[PDB]
């Protein structure tokens, strides 16, 4: 004889179907993350890492590193050809 109780029965009722499914996905995606640009890790110098933080950086990454690599390759090849040819 008791009336229905919508706001009293919300323990099992969630927000539709998709919103409750994505609530767990969105609650923790924003929890454990850097606030703003933390840990840049820019500093690196290990020849390969020296190239990474010197010319191979993605801020520009223009053809200048490629031209420098080609210049070094042809400089080595000149001596190689002198040895061979």
């Amino acid at each position: 004889v008791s009336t229905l109780i919508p706001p009293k029965v919300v323990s099992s009722k969630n927000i539709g179907s998709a919103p409750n499914a994505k609530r767990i996905a969105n609650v923790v995606h924003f929890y454990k993350s850097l606030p703003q640009g933390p840990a840049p890790a820019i500093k690196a110098n290990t020849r390969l890492a020296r190239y990474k933080a010197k010319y191979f950086d993605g801020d520009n990454a223009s053809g200048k590193p490629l031209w420098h690599f080609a210049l070094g390759i042809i400089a080595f090849g000149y001596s190689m050809e002198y040895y061979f040819h």
């Binding site: 008791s2 009336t3 229905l4 919508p6 706001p7």
Partner: protein
């Protein structure tokens, strides 16, 4: 006492946002409404239990 109860009941009825799709609470609402109607009918139609022998005898 009935005035405040009617106020809150009607406010709840008109403010239903997640309280829709009901089948029996409205039935209890009409039960209370007809009960109050019977109350009013009994008060307005109160017959005299004792015989009015002062003017009828």
């Amino acid at each position: 006492a009935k005035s405040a109860a009617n106020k809150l009941d009607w406010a709840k009825v008109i403010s239903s946002l997640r309280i829709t799709g009901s089948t029996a609470t409205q039935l209890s609402s009409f039960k209370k409404r007809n009960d109050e109607a019977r109350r009013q009918l009994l008060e307005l139609q109160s017959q005299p239990t004792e015989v009015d022998f002062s003017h009828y005898r």
